[PDB]
């Protein structure tokens, strides 16, 4: 890929975060806490899962950012509609307004319905996410493997503004406490 030059400065939106998440002062890192984080509930917060949105909203153009996933056992990354459901149980699918990939139990999968197996030779420590609003494209790149393509969603029906989407995953095992981190330009 040569997509680096549509780089956008993403920050996390505290108000959308699950109440157990801890967002750094610079709003560039998020991790699971060991308890509820002493914040009020609001209609924006994801209730059931350790999810948060980016502050940025996109309705046009080309956007690129990178996320560090070092030493995590489980995570979800991509983009979603601003209008996605926040409360209760739901699946990550384009029909529900999500364009995502994940790591779960040593397998990488794209969030189609049903989910699609990914073929990654070099487990990634850093993921690049590229959105072309007009083209209807969301692509994922393996930064650890010289930017090799992971997966492309095409003919996407965004149907409104998009937000960067993050899930740090649960930490039942004790091996998934590490943060997601937005990487510098
Ligand atoms: C009581 C309850 O249902 N939970 C507590 C904890 C672990 C599972 C679930 C949950 C969802 C989101 C964030 C934190 C949690």
Swiss-Prot record:
<protein>
    <recommendedName>
        <fullName>E3 ubiquitin-protein ligase TRIM21</fullName>
    </recommendedName>
</protein>
<feature type="domain" description="B30.2/SPRY">
    <location>
        <begin position="8"/>
        <end position="185"/>
    </location>
</feature>
<comment type="subunit">
    <text>Homotrimer. Component of a SCF(SKP2)-like complex containing CUL1, SKP1, TRIM21 and SKP2. Interacts with CALR, CUL1, FBXW11, HSPA5, IKBKB, IRF3, SKP1 and VCP. Interacts with SKP2; the interaction with SKP2 does not depend on an intact F-box domain. Interacts (via N-terminus and C-terminus) with DCP2 (via N-terminus and C-terminus). Interacts (via C-terminus) with IRF8 (via C-terminus). Interacts with ULK1, BECN1 and with ATG8 family members, including GABARAP, GABARAPL1, GABARAPL2 and MAP1LC3C/LC3C. Interacts with TRIM21 and SQSTM1/sequestosome 1. Interacts with IRF3.</text>
</comment>
<comment type="function">
    <text>E3 ubiquitin-protein ligase whose activity is dependent on E2 enzymes, UBE2D1, UBE2D2, UBE2E1 and UBE2E2. Forms a ubiquitin ligase complex in cooperation with the E2 UBE2D2 that is used not only for the ubiquitination of USP4 and IKBKB but also for its self-ubiquitination. Component of cullin-RING-based SCF (SKP1-CUL1-F-box protein) E3 ubiquitin-protein ligase complexes such as SCF(SKP2)-like complexes. A TRIM21-containing SCF(SKP2)-like complex is shown to mediate ubiquitination of CDKN1B ('Thr-187' phosphorylated-form), thereby promoting its degradation by the proteasome.</text>
</comment>
<comment type="similarity">
    <text>Belongs to the TRIM/RBCC family.</text>
</comment>
């Amino acid at each position: 890929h040569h997509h680096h030059h549509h780089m956008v400065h993403i920050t996390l939106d505290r108000n959308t975060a699950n109440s157990w998440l801890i967002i750094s002062k610079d709003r560039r890192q998020v991790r699971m806490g060991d308890t509820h984080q002493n914040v009020s509930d609001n209609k924006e917060r994801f209730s059931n899962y350790p999810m948060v949105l980016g502050a940025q909203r996109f309705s046009s153009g080309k956007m690129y950012w990178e996320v560090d996933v070092t030493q995590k056992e489980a995570w979800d990354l991509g983009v979603c509609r601003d209008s996605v459901q926040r409360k209760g149980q739901f699946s990550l699918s384009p029909e529900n307004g999500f364009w995502t990939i994940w790591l779960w139990q040593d397998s990488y999968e794209a969030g189609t319905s049903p989910q699609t197996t990914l073929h990654i030779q070099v487990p990634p420590c850093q993921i690049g996410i590229f959105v072309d609003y007009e083209a209807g494209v969301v692509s994922f790149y393996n930064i650890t493997d010289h930017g090799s393509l992971i997966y492309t969603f095409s003919e996407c029906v965004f149907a409104g503004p998009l937000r960067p989407f993050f899930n740090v995953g649960f930490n039942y095992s004790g091996g998934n406490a590490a943060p997601l981190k937005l990487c510098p330009l």
